[PDB]
């Protein structure tokens, strides 16, 4: 019983794995290869920076 | 002077590869790089000022590091059009001139000069090529606008365009940013990183080698003189990082993975400027731009045009000597003891705690443990078995250049206390 | 030293049999096991009727390696050292033409000299090699014809069911540790003169010191072992269940009387276990 | 002296690595284990065989190394477990020069007189560990190299935040261990620092939620499994609580301590009850391990000179065993063909006292006393006792499941009825055998010997969670 438990904390780290493998798929579906998305991306992403600081 | 050397080749070699055969022109960028580099060592510890330009201990480092790029990137590129020899130069003094200045006006105008025949660099006149020229082409002008416009509100906030004005309140702020904003889309930080995958992905190879090191030093160097405020370099920080390792997890391809680790790369660099130790970020760069170049060198004996990951593996069975520098590469890259890219990274790490930045560097570091699966992934699968894959073995050239560059790494793995004296001013 | 040669003997003389052993005719090795037996008794009854005997050395800091042989440890030496060769001559009739004759004999040096520590003990650790010792020999003497499957789960069941009460005479061991920090039986008893201490947890520690006794002479619930233990030959039934192994069940008791003539509760409980 | 212990095993392993052959390395690893040997039987105190070298200074970073009566101890152990991995190996695909970099690489993390230097060997040995595992065996290779990796690296990276914090928040010089010392960190600091070494430690102890890297590595390396065994030697973490994260940063350990007390505990308890549920040795041994592990970090963590010691010295002898028990499965899995329990069943009479051999082995393994794991086994429940009684007894419905794997596996594996027969004993096996029944017997009869070099630290280390 507690054998095949093991196995399945080994396999939630694993998840943990996957978590990370697709927020990161995520993360890289950001880049459309769209000009006009990187603009827009941008200009979002100066606005962000911007209103941190002041 | 370097800047002598750099403009004298430049102009000299513009008209006079109209009556020089391509490869004497290479021999002659090629020599004038070596040249202005020569120079940098002759005066380690001049600093020498001028107008606006100024060569203290960063600019030559940077430049040190920029002119090895340039360096090695003219190496590979054997190609016929004296001009694809001609830009790099021109490129190269650009770089020399944005590290060498506080002065905004002088440093947009440096910024142009290295970053317009990069452009014109992304042609392989592939369709993928032109579509990265583009991409940064725009993006890049758009960026210029930005910190054009950060100027002059540098100007606004306080009656110079030289960094190092005393700086009022709001207005300042917001000129830092809007600096920020062009000086790091420069530097490939998040959010302003958009471009480096497909231009990395698009470019030729030795082109892409040319940018990943020494653009990026020169950036950084920039980035340096800048005052850059705690919460504005957290931001991009945990951005690049997360982003970075991430995102790289994805990818399928060597170049553009190698693009997104640059993204978190930089974003480790950044935490040296928590305290703008530039002993560290020096010494981070080194390691960087020495790895990188080899990285690049390696994938583009490959493939210039693009390089898939299973095309790395059985590296080691066709060149050994190759496989272990690429390893070694990957492990120096990962910051994996005793590797002179884990002294970068614990120098990095260090200003950010010493600033006492330390949620922005936990999180730098979790997600730094976490790259370990595509650095990995690359080093190790050296050893695969080969699948059928383009491979053109190198001159002695490249192959004792990996190798060194390599063996250089791990040389000061062991022993950074050879170099790390003396990354400062220069005593 | 010489009350040390009491347990060498049957130690030295056991490594032989498993060291070489095969590299003897067939009359000999029960020969030299109940030779070392015989100066065992002998050699160690020449201690006894000297007046008794002692030994003190280095081990763990604070938990020294004591042999005490006094009246009560003289009659341990003698029962276990004479039955035990008594039986040893007759294994050597018994088993014949037996390959593993080195085997047997050497189990049964073994066995002796675990049982020898075991009685000859003034601190409870060294005492605990005696049992987890004899428990051992037990092990490798049930399951001695090993080519049977049986004749193996019947060691295995010996070797746990026996640890499950080894469990509370390290639990109670750690007890009288924790309390008076002496670990030793003369100077453990020396301590308990007086008022006691934490009386409940004393009761506490004599009661797992007694669940420790009950698997090693079989008493409830951890009666179920010891039929099992019948898969060995003959005459390893008789020093298990006669001279050795079942005796320390009670003589444990017997040297820990000065911690359960103190225990009006756990020594009922004691007697009861016994009747039932 | 010590930098050329720690180097030896290192260039050994070098000269191995391109050069060849084994014998060469073989006699290497035989003489770095007669000179540790040899500094386990001379040091008077604390201190021993210093070293300070400049590495980074300017960071506080320096090259220290010295020998505690713990220190030293654990060179012996090591030395000797490769040794032994070493001489019988049949693994020898010339990467004994990979097992050699290990070693040293190891004695250097145990010798680190310096934080950042000892974060180096922590993180260095990482990868000699990996490449054993990548390009010398297991089907599974990929999966459980990288999960062993990113495992101890993100238990290990964020680590370096602490390791930072315990110099910088403290206003200490440098990174010599003395000198951090002699800078206390403040509550809410002290907290933070400790969790950091805390997390990287559990996770390489193997503490419960954070051992499921231990049994996919302990499969996938060659079946053989010498690189188990120097796997088990970079288990370190119970060492790197008392040497390391416990004094460093004690006032945070306090809040933690009932919780890593818990942890260790149910560890043994949980290791030694799966590790019935085993169906091949890799597997038995691995689960084996993380309940032996989860008895040494419950004699550290309780405090208690008596635990603390017998926590260490625990760790060291089972280093041996271990190595042992692993490096003979190879040994029978040459000659079998598997590493599966129950086929090929009755080995005993085909083999000769192999069967003493691996009996000797698994009894030292339960902690039958006269053998080494008891001694420490038992100095470990003396203090955890004193700690929390009932975690203690907790932990310690252990020996009965340790009994019952190593029991059911020696049966299934020797005992029963005859198979087809096997080889004796090489020339090899024979030295394997001697030195290590020699070892066991020493290091758990003498148990006096071993380990007075402990008491010192032990009592001190303790006295620094008193007053
Ligand atoms: C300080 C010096 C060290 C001394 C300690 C050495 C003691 C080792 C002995 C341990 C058990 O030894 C035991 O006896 C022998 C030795 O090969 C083995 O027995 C084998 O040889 C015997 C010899 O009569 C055969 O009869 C038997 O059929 C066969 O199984 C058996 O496998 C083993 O389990």
Same mark, same amino acid.
């Given at each position: 019983?507690?054998?095949?438990?093991?196995?399945?904390?080994?396999?939630?780290?694993?998840?943990?794995?996957?978590?990370?493998?697709?927020?990161?798929?995520?993360?890289?579906?950001?880049?459309?290869?769209?000009?006009?998305?990187?603009?827009?991306?941008?200009?979002?992403?100066?606005?962000?920076?911007?209103?941190?600081?002041? | 002077?370097?800047?002598?050397?750099?403009?004298?080749?430049?102009?000299?070699?513009?008209?006079?590869?109209?009556?020089?055969? =391509?490869?004497?022109?290479?021999?002659?960028?090629?020599?004038?790089?070596?040249?202005?580099?020569?120079?940098?060592?002759?005066?380690?510890?001049?600093?020498?000022?001028?107008?606006?330009?100024?060569?203290?201990?960063?600019?030559?480092?940077?430049?040190?590091?920029?002119?090895?790029?340039?360096?090695?990137?003219?190496?590979?590129?054997?190609?016929?059009?004296?001009?694809?020899?001609?830009?790099?130069?021109?490129?190269?003094?650009?770089?020399?001139?944005?590290?060498?200045?506080?002065?905004?006006?002088?440093?947009?105008?440096?910024?142009?000069?290295?970053?317009?025949?990069?452009?014109?660099?992304?042609?392989?006149?592939?369709?993928?090529?032109?579509?990265?020229?583009?991409?940064?082409?725009?993006?890049?002008?758009?960026?210029?606008?930005?910190?054009?416009?950060?100027?002059?509100?540098?100007?606004?906030?306080?009656?110079?365009?030289?960094?190092?004005?005393?700086?009022?309140?709001?207005?300042?702020?917001?000129?830092?940013?809007?600096?920020?904003?062009?000086?790091?889309?420069?530097?490939?930080?998040?959010?302003?990183?958009?471009?480096?995958?497909?231009?990395?992905?698009?470019?030729?190879?030795?082109?892409?080698?040319?940018?990943?090191?020494?653009?990026?030093?020169?950036?950084?160097?920039?980035?340096?003189?800048?005052?850059?405020?705690?919460?504005?370099?957290?931001?991009?920080?945990?951005?690049?990082?997360?982003?970075?390792?991430?995102?790289?997890?994805?990818?399928?391809?060597?170049?553009?993975?190698?693009?997104?680790?640059?993204?978190?790369?930089?974003?480790?660099?950044?935490?040296?400027?928590?305290?703008?130790?530039?002993?560290?970020?020096?010494?981070?760069?080194?390691?960087?731009?020495?790895?990188?170049?080899?990285?690049?060198?390696?994938?583009?004996?490959?493939?210039?045009?693009?390089? =898939?990951?299973?095309?790395?593996?059985?590296?080691?069975?066709?060149?050994?000597?190759?496989?272990?520098?690429?390893?070694?590469?990957?492990?120096?890259?990962?910051?994996?003891?005793?590797?002179?890219?884990?002294?970068?990274?614990?120098?990095?790490?260090?200003?950010?705690?010493?600033?006492?930045?330390?949620?922005?560097?936990?999180?730098?570091?979790?997600?730094?443990?976490?790259?370990?699966?595509?650095?990995?992934?690359?080093?190790?699968?050296?050893?695969?078995?080969?699948?059928?894959?383009?491979?053109?073995?190198?001159?002695?050239?490249?192959?004792?250049?990996?190798?060194?560059?390599?063996?250089?790494?791990?040389?000061?793995?062991?022993?950074?206390?050879?170099?790390?004296?003396?990354?400062?001013?220069?005593? | 030293?010489?009350?040390?040669?009491?347990?060498?003997?049957?130690?030295?003389?056991?490594?032989?049999?498993?060291?070489?052993?095969?590299?003897?005719?067939?009359?000999?090795?029960?020969?030299?096991?109940?030779?070392?037996?015989?100066?065992?008794?002998?050699?160690?009854?020449?201690?006894?009727?000297?007046?008794?005997?002692?030994?003190? !050395?280095?081990?763990?800091?604070?938990?020294?390696?004591?042999?005490?042989?006094?009246?009560?440890?003289?009659?341990?030496?003698?029962?276990?050292?004479?039955?035990?060769?008594?039986?040893?001559?007759?294994?050597?009739?018994?088993?014949?033409?037996?390959?593993?004759?080195?085997?047997?004999?050497?189990?049964?040096?073994?066995?002796?000299?675990?049982?020898?520590?075991?009685?000859?003990?003034?601190?409870?650790?060294?005492?605990?090699?005696?049992?987890?010792?004899?428990?051992?020999?037990?092990?490798?003497?049930?399951?001695?014809?090993?080519?049977?499957?049986?004749?193996?789960?019947?060691?295995?069941? !010996?070797?746990?069911?026996?640890?499950?009460?080894?469990?509370?005479?390290?639990?109670?061991? !750690?007890?009288?540790?924790?309390?008076?920090?002496?670990?030793?039986?003369?100077?453990?008893?020396?301590?308990?003169?007086?008022?006691?201490?934490?009386?409940?947890?004393?009761?506490?520690?004599? #009661?797992?010191?007694?669940?420790?006794?009950?698997?090693?002479?079989?008493?409830?619930?951890?009666?179920?072992?010891?039929?099992?233990?019948?898969?060995?030959?003959?005459?390893?039934? !008789?020093?298990?269940?006669?001279?050795?192994?079942?005796?320390?069940?009670?003589? #444990?008791?017997?040297?820990?009387?000065?911690?359960?003539?103190?225990?009006?509760?756990?020594?009922?409980?004691?007697?009861?276990?016994?009747?039932? | 002296?010590?930098?050329?212990?720690?180097?030896?095993?290192?260039?050994?392993?070098?000269?191995?690595?391109?050069?060849?052959?084994?014998?060469?390395?073989?006699?290497? *690893?035989?003489?770095?284990?007669?000179?540790?040997?040899?500094?386990?039987?001379?040091?008077?105190?604390?201190?021993?065989?210093?070293?300070?070298?400049?590495?980074?200074?300017?960071?506080?970073?320096?090259?220290?190394?010295?020998?505690?009566?713990?220190?030293?101890?654990?060179?012996?152990? &090591?030395?000797?477990?490769?040794?032994?991995?070493?001489?019988?190996?049949?693994?020898?695909?010339?990467?004994?020069?990979?097992?050699?970099?290990?070693?040293?690489?190891?004695?250097?993390?145990? *010798?680190?007189?310096? @934080?950042?230097?000892?974060?180096?060997?922590?993180?260095?040995? %990482?990868?000699?560990?990996?490449?054993?595992?990548?390009?010398?065996?297991?089907?599974?290779?990929?999966?459980?190299?990288?999960?062993?990796?990113?495992?101890?690296?993100?238990?290990?990276?964020?680590?370096?935040?602490?390791?930072?914090?315990?110099?910088?928040?403290?206003?200490?010089?440098?990174?010599?261990?003395?000198?951090?010392?002699?800078?206390?960190?403040?509550?809410?600091?002290?907290?933070?620092?400790?969790?950091?070494?805390?997390?990287?430690?559990?996770?390489?102890?193997?503490?419960?939620?954070?051992?499921?890297?231990?049994?996919?590595?302990?499969?996938?390396?060659?079946?053989?499994?010498?690189?188990?065994?120097?796997?088990?030697?970079?288990?370190?973490?119970?060492?790197?609580?008392?040497?390391?994260?416990?004094?460093?940063?004690?006032?945070?350990?306090?809040?933690?301590?009932?919780?890593?007390?818990?942890? *260790?505990?149910?560890?043994?308890?949980?290791?030694?009850?799966?590790?019935?549920?085993?169906?091949?040795?890799?597997?038995?041994? *691995?689960?084996?391990?993380?309940?032996?592990?989860?008895?040494?970090?419950?004699?550290?963590?309780?405090?208690?000179?008596?635990?603390?010691?017998?926590?260490?010295?625990?760790?060291?002898?089972?280093?041996?065993?271990?190595?042992?028990?692993? @490096? %003979?499965?190879?040994?029978?899995?040459?000659?079998?063909?598997?590493?599966?329990?129950?086929?090929?069943?009755?080995?005993?009479?085909?083999?000769?006292?192999?069967?003493?051999?691996?009996? &000797?082995?698994?009894?030292?393994?339960?902690?039958?006393?006269?053998?080494?794991?008891?001694?420490?086994?038992?100095?470990?429940?003396?203090?955890?006792?004193?700690?929390?009684?009932?975690?203690?007894?907790?932990?310690?419905?252990?020996? &009965?499941?340790?009994?019952?794997?190593?029991?059911?596996?020696?049966?299934?594996?020797?005992?029963?009825?005859?198979?087809?027969?096997?080889?004796?004993?090489?020339?090899?096996?024979?030295?394997?055998?001697?030195?290590?029944?020699?070892?066991?017997?020493?290091?758990?009869?003498?148990?006096?010997?071993?380990?007075?070099?402990?008491?010192?630290?032990?009592?001190?280390?303790?006295?620094?969670?008193?007053?």
């Amino acid at each position: 019983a507690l054998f095949y438990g093991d196995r399945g904390l080994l396999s939630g780290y694993f998840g943990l794995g996957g978590a990370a493998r697709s927020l990161g798929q995520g993360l890289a579906r950001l880049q459309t290869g769209y000009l006009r998305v990187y603009a827009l991306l941008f200009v979002l992403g100066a606005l962000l920076l911007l209103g941190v600081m002041r | 002077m370097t800047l002598a050397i750099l403009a004298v080749f430049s102009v000299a070699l513009t008209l006079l590869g109209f009556v020089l055969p =391509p490869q004497g022109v290479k021999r002659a960028t090629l020599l004038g790089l070596a040249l202005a580099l020569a120079s940098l060592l002759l005066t380690w510890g001049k600093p020498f000022a001028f107008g606006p330009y100024a060569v203290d201990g960063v600019s030559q480092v940077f430049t040190l590091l920029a002119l090895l790029g340039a360096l090695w990137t003219v190496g590979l590129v054997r190609s016929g059009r004296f001009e694809f020899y001609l830009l790099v130069l021109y490129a190269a003094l650009g770089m020399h001139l944005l590290a060498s200045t506080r002065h905004l006006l002088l440093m947009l105008v440096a910024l142009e000069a290295l970053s317009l025949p990069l452009y014109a660099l992304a042609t392989w006149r592939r369709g993928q090529g032109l579509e990265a020229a583009l991409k940064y082409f725009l993006l890049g002008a758009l960026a210029a606008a930005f910190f054009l416009y950060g100027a002059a509100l540098f100007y606004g906030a306080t009656g110079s365009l030289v960094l190092g004005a005393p700086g009022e309140g709001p207005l300042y702020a917001l000129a830092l940013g809007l600096l920020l904003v062009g000086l790091g889309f420069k530097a490939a930080l998040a959010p302003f990183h958009f471009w480096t995958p497909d231009v990395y992905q698009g470019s030729p190879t030795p082109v892409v080698l040319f940018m990943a090191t020494s653009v990026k030093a020169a950036a950084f160097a920039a980035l340096l003189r800048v005052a850059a405020p705690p919460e504005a370099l957290a931001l991009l920080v945990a951005l690049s990082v997360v982003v970075g390792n991430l995102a790289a997890l994805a990818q399928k391809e060597a170049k553009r993975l190698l693009a997104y680790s640059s993204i978190a790369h930089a974003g480790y660099m950044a935490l040296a400027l928590y305290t703008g130790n530039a002993q560290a970020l020096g010494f981070y760069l080194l390691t960087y731009v020495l790895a990188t170049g080899l990285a690049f060198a390696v994938l583009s004996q490959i493939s210039p045009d693009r390089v =898939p990951l299973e095309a790395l593996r059985g590296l080691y069975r066709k060149d050994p000597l190759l496989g272990l520098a690429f390893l070694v590469a990957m492990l120096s890259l990962l910051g994996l003891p005793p590797l002179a890219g884990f002294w970068g990274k614990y120098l990095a790490f260090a200003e950010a705690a010493r600033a006492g930045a330390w949620g922005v560097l936990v999180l730098a570091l979790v997600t730094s443990a976490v790259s370990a699966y595509y650095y990995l992934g690359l080093g190790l699968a050296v050893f695969a078995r080969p699948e059928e894959t383009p491979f053109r073995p190198g001159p002695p050239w490249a192959r004792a250049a990996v190798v060194a560059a390599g063996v250089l790494l791990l040389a000061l793995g062991l022993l950074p206390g050879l170099v790390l004296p003396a990354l400062a001013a220069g005593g | 030293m010489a009350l040390l040669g009491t347990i060498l003997l049957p130690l030295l003389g056991f490594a032989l049999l498993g060291l070489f052993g095969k590299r003897m005719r067939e009359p000999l090795p029960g020969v030299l096991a109940s030779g070392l037996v015989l100066a065992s008794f002998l050699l160690g009854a020449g201690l006894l009727l000297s007046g008794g005997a002692r030994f003190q !050395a280095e081990w763990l800091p604070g938990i020294p390696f004591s042999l005490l042989l006094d009246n009560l440890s003289g009659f341990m030496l003698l029962i276990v050292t004479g039955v035990g060769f008594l039986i040893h001559v007759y294994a050597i009739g018994y088993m014949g033409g037996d390959p593993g004759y080195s085997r047997f004999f050497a189990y049964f040096n073994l066995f002796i000299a675990m049982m020898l520590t075991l009685v000859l003990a003034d601190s409870y650790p060294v005492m605990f090699i005696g049992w987890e010792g004899v428990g051992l020999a037990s092990f490798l003497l049930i399951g001695f014809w090993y080519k049977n499957p049986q004749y193996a789960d019947s060691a295995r069941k !010996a070797f746990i069911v026996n640890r499950i009460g080894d469990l509370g005479f390290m639990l109670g061991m !750690a007890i009288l540790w924790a309390l008076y920090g002496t670990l030793s039986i003369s100077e453990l008893k020396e301590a308990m003169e007086g008022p006691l201490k934490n009386p409940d947890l004393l009761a506490l520690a004599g #009661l797992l010191l007694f669940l420790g006794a009950v698997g090693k002479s079989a008493q409830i619930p951890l009666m179920v072992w010891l039929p099992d233990a019948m898969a060995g030959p003959t005459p390893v039934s !008789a020093l298990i269940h006669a001279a050795t192994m079942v005796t320390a069940g009670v003589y #444990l008791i017997a040297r820990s009387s000065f911690l359960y003539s103190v225990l009006p509760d756990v020594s009922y409980a004691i007697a009861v276990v016994g009747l039932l | 002296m010590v930098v050329l212990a720690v180097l030896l095993p290192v260039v050994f392993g070098a000269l191995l690595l391109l050069g060849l052959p084994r014998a060469l390395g073989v006699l290497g *690893a035989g003489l770095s284990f007669l000179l540790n040997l040899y500094l386990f039987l001379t040091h008077p105190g604390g201190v021993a065989h210093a070293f300070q070298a400049p590495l980074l200074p300017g960071a506080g970073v320096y090259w220290a190394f010295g020998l505690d009566g713990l220190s030293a101890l654990f060179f012996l152990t &090591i030395a000797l477990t490769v040794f032994l991995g070493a001489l019988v190996a049949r693994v020898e695909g010339r990467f004994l020069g990979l097992a050699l970099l290990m070693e040293g690489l190891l004695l250097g993390l145990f *010798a680190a007189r310096d @934080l950042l230097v000892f974060y180096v060997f922590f993180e260095a040995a %990482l990868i000699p560990a990996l490449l054993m595992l990548y390009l010398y065996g297991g089907e599974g290779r990929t999966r459980a190299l990288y999960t062993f990796v990113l495992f101890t690296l993100v238990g290990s990276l964020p680590m370096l935040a602490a390791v930072l914090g315990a110099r910088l928040l403290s206003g200490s010089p440098t990174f010599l261990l003395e000198d951090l010392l002699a800078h206390p960190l403040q509550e809410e600091a002290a907290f933070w620092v400790f969790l950091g070494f805390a997390l990287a430690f559990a996770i390489k102890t193997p503490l419960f939620p954070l051992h499921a890297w231990l049994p996919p590595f302990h499969q996938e390396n060659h079946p053989s499994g010498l690189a188990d065994a120097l796997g088990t030697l970079y288990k370190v973490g119970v060492f790197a609580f008392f040497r390391f994260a416990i004094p460093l940063a004690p006032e945070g350990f306090a809040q933690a301590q009932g919780l890593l007390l818990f942890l *260790a505990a149910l560890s043994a308890l949980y290791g030694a009850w799966v590790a019935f549920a085993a169906k091949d040795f890799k597997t038995l041994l *691995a689960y084996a391990g993380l309940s032996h592990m989860g008895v040494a970090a419950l004699g550290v963590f309780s405090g208690t000179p008596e635990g603390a010691m017998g926590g260490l010295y625990l760790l060291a002898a089972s280093g041996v065993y271990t190595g042992g028990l692993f @490096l %003979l499965a190879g040994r029978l899995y040459e000659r079998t063909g598997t590493l599966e329990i129950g086929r090929y069943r009755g080995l005993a009479q085909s083999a000769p006292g192999l069967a003493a051999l691996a009996l &000797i082995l698994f009894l030292a393994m339960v902690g039958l006393p006269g053998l080494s794991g008891f001694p420490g086994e038992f100095l470990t429940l003396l203090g955890a006792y004193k700690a929390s009684p009932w975690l203690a007894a907790l932990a310690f419905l252990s020996v &009965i499941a340790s009994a019952a794997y190593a029991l059911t596996a020696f049966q299934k594996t020797f005992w029963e009825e005859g198979g087809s027969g096997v080889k004796d004993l090489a020339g090899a096996e024979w030295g394997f055998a001697l030195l290590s029944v020699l070892a066991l017997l020493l290091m758990g009869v003498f148990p006096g010997y071993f380990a007075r070099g402990l008491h010192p630290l032990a009592e001190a280390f303790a006295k620094l969670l008193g007053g």
